[model samples]
Target: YFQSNALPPDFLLDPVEVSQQLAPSLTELVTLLDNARTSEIGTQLEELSVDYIVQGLLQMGWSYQPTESFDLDAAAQCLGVVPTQVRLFERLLQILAEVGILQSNQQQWQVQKTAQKVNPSKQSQSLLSQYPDEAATLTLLERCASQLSGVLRGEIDPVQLVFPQGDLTTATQLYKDSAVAKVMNTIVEKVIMKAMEKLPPSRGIRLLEIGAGTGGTTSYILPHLNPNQTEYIFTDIGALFTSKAQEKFQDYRFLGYQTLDIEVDPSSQGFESHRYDVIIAANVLHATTSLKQTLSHVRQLLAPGGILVLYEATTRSRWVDLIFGLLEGWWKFTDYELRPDYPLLNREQWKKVLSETGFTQVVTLPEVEGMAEALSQQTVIVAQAAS
Candidate 1:
């Protein structure tokens, strides 16, 4: 697993364009929501909705690489877990929708107007309510999670839910004021910052990310590359994403982004055997179709003594572990379902995977402070290719 480098301080992310891109699609989906709220039952809406937002953001202007080295901490704070709670709440509401508990209300159906009226007060409340007390802080986050989940899942459309009348500016402002939005931005920032830390101002360090969604990781890490020593290569299955990343980071002197599917053979894409110095995958190994083969290919990419880094979630919940382990071991899933999010590894599984794949001196770095107790915050492993 790849580990991020040191954090940059006060590095700001202007997601204005990103927000704009997602506005249409996000609002469209959000409009379908009702108020009853029931996603705890396990529905697919959470994943689908987030995927929609990610694709939408890429359509917006998220075209960029990592934040600069001078400001990694800002990225770290971005990757914090507080943001995930919002995601959880989204899932919860979607589940409720799935159960028909979150009913739709045509009376609350003014798409543009509701956004206009509610947006101002909503923004003020969210911003002013950023309390120092943990519990108070949590309550606000929870509300953001709940309401935002409704918005995303179609229980409450922007026209009805937003405060100011039909003002996209106010709506966007209110959206940013959302605790879930803030935390999620922070989480993405942190994850990429960590990946950037692992990549020095050193050239010939070959890096690849499997699920480079809208190039979020790249946005935070590219700024840190040593103009002369560093080079980055990003790959994903989505053409829209790769195109945006390429365009946004076009100024990155040593960065490159490509479209790729890890399950495909690297050699088929003209990857020279043993040609890379390092291999990095973030939040992606769990979704690999053939774990052994994927590692084998990674090993093949590295020059003798080159390193491979990966970051992924690990879980202690026996049920989570059991379900994930089974899926990894014997499950065959469609591409959409196969996209791994569950199989949080335990210590034993981590060790077993590394040893079986010929990795020596393996290490796992825990993102203890940033992770929820239900999941391994972050686990980083560093291993070398031997002659």
Candidate 2:
């Protein structure tokens, strides 16, 4: 079992060494930091390093030139790096230019000093001083951003990195056990339980879950549903996932398995209109080709007075922006885009869409705090179908 105190291994600093350096070890600090700037440590470090380098450039009398082009080769030699690593130097310079550490023209890089010299450690530690649990989540977001960056440069394939081709068991298990997923499952469980209580005990509740990957959310929702009075449909786009869910929930007589694709018409796939009393989609709607079409179809499947519970990441983080932006390029359809044809809908956007799709009432759960927002992007939207 995973504890809040336990963190996924940290490679940058040894668990032993990192623990000894601070007033309390990073592991101990895990529960303390609620919503500090801990998650953006990687970006903070990059910003700090860029600032330091810019300061050096200023001391060396580097001048800002708006019109002149910056030559990588000359700059590399000026920096005194070996010819073999000139490309690496060039990349760093480009990043510096991006953050305004250096001024730049189309062909040339210019030296520029930022107005303020930033100290990320001062800002990061102030947050870590108060909240600790943020450290673990912060570690995760940084790693995801780093790996996804590699994916964009064609240096690594994400399929191989995490979601491998043949067997997704390991990746699936990791997700099920992750801190972020657990928090979401906890939030969703409350919503499902409350909804179930409102339903009549004599009649069974017909429930369908969209993109129920490896039964992670199902694992949480199943235990709460009355087996004798609930029919749960575990569905996904492929056999690999649906089959896995079937195997996982085999003991539950109320459970059903289907390969349901959200992007297409559910009726065509034998998903009946006004059939389900409840529909759950966890972190899956963003994958739909058309949000409008998908929500319209989802509304059609729900019975009158039925509830639709959606668990999605509605906010953006620095790491999310980097990783998702790369994912959009690597696999445009499957991975979410920071700026896509349909972006991650904000709270207002969610209400607007739900209203337009014919939902009579809409509500959000566990109004998140600033601290939790840094680590987990998951938010729950509970909507009722119009009678």
Candidate 3:
């Protein structure tokens, strides 16, 4: 579905200026975001979003290519996704109708004008600079959008693109090396280092990392520990991830690998109760069907004064939906009543959930109003388990 090799115009931003300010690198990855609303590309991206939705419809045999007006049900059947994703897909349809890209009458819908083709060669010549990583991320985002139909139809694996040929470079850049991810990791490391400083020091620290996917946060935590005195269990739902981690992190004798599904109880999964002095779950907890239950299990795994640190996205944008939405787990939240429209929880919601689930002294990094809420809504939080 891609018509060009280069990214859309306005996709690249001055990361230097954005870093000087407080915007996430991802803010302008899609033109619809707040960072791009100031520019003309937002208007263009409305067409791109429409293009994504329409291409999927065609894949589902709706080539109203439209003498044939179809209803939402038709679209749902053709653009079929996991049950949880249906509502989100429907939301996209409603947006198309709202924007006049699709006309609705008598509960039927019909396509309007086709989307414009973008040739980025002209723009790419001048846009190339120090933002290569940002540009690379945007390219992957474009790939995700382009594969919308295949992903929704279950013919494509999101991880194939997310990890791509077992290379974690993009994933690392997304969650570790990117500006926002780098900042969040630093904050998480700071919080963890503080917790380490305050440890009893009578014994070595035993740390447990949940969903240590690609060991992004694990990289920060493992290096600081005394290899002989510490125990770091790097765990993920995927055995393959732990295996890859085994290869990536070999110098640390303290680190161990195992499979862990945070949605389930850790005790039943062979974990000792109240064993860990520190637990880190980065960009992982919200995917659980029950965040409270997940945290309860995390609490169960922590020692009396153990600390829990998290890197979570407290905001959701359409760009997030259009990309990560392809994964079945993205829509697997049974706790829709809490998130309502999205899987993420806002910072206040996170605090409330943490407090309710037996945590104390919960803190969100960049906790102040202006910078905290403004920078991508990705929060680094630290909470102490209350035994």
Candidate 4:
């Protein structure tokens, strides 16, 4: 349920300085991709994923007999997935067919052949030695690639895959531990602190974090604020995270946990309109059906002139899909006009969306030019709700 694990960078560099530092690691990451033989690694991941899917199908009692075809709803029934998940399940099958792992004729699907069992070992010691946080991404990818099918088939949990055996260190080391998260979290705190400064002295700061999964960002932000003058609320769609967050963050007298869904109107959920001083949505907005609608609701939740800090992925990475996309929520976005294929908006697209949706003073970090597009994929945006 965590959004980002990386604490702010030690130096807390400026936008220009941050992008400048990202170049070396970008080159190294690219080098690792090439040396690792990208094609072989991709094929290896595909084979493993396909193998898992086939195993799941077999467990569902699909026959291996020739000319035997499986219906989409039938497979959905076998997999014990709900009606809403049928579309994602069907897409998974279509992807397999598209890659020749399965055969589909007029939506009638069957396995074409079994996977080749080729294992591609691409791990290199000291890979991207200049940026170990970013390099840790590969190891995380390796772990998820191995367990994707297990998660897909519901045999394993996603958070359990990353944070196995209560290894919270490894969990943060994977996603937010990257160079991108460092810069973004730094900017997020800076903007939020500014909001804290701007709040009228008579009133304390009310910070509501939507999709505040595991308090990764909160872990960094809480230390910067004066608890006596701050009311920090952590919210997620699931109470599992909220319950655990209560146990983890209960020590902070000013902090509390609640359930909030961005897709639903916060007003209907008893959140007062224009109440919060700052709203933080980190890597969670894209999962919503419409960015415009989500932001409109977010604006409604924030007081006029309140700050909204966001850490988002401007470009989709294969690692994101391998680890996170197997869930049904990944395919729930219905805004085809703004987001054609992927559930992501480019930096420019985001800028456009925020401005059009009643946010003013929009600012996105790293400029999208320097570090030779290294920071292009990762971004931090700060904006104010228009009065």
Which candidate has the highest TM-score of all?
A: 3
lDDT of 2 by residue, 239-308 (tens): 8888767777888888888899887889999888877877999877765555777789899898766778
Could you tell me every candidate's TM-score relative to the true structure? Answer: 0.45, 0.62, 0.77, 0.68
lDDT tens per residue, model 3, 36-116: 322233234344556666566565665554345777666667657655456666666667667666777777777775534
> Candidate 1: where are CA atoms >4 Å away?
1-204, 316-342, 367-375
> If ranked by lDDT, best first, what sequence of candidates would result?
3, 4, 2, 1
Tens digit of per-residue lDDT, candidate 1, span 1-387: 323332221121112322333335433433332212212111222332333333322332322232212122232233231332333332332333343323323311111110011232243244334432223322333233334434433444423332223322222322233233233333333333343343433223555555564554455556655667555677766566566557667788677677666666776776666656556665556656556666777776666555566655554222122112222221322233323433345555765666777776565443233232222333445555555
lDDT of 4 by residue, 19-71 (tens): 34554543444333232333344444444455444544554455544456777
TM-score of 3: 0.77
Candidate 1 has what TM-score? 0.45
Model 2 ranges with Cα > 4 A deviation: 1-150, 153-157, 165-180, 321-342, 368-377
* CA lDDT of every candidate: 0.42, 0.59, 0.66, 0.65
Tell me how candidate 1 scores on lDDT.
Answer: 0.42
Query: What local lDDT score does residue 21 receive in model 4, on the 0 to 100 scale?
Result: 52
The better-scoring model by lDDT among 1 and 3 is: 3
Instruction: Judge candidate 2 at residue 252 and give its lDDT.
Output: 86
Candidate 1 vs candidate 2, lDDT winner: 2
Better of 2 and 4 by TM-score: 4
Mark the 10 consecutive residues where model 1 has the least summed lDDT: 108-117
Ten contiguous residues with the weakest lDDT in model 3: 7-16
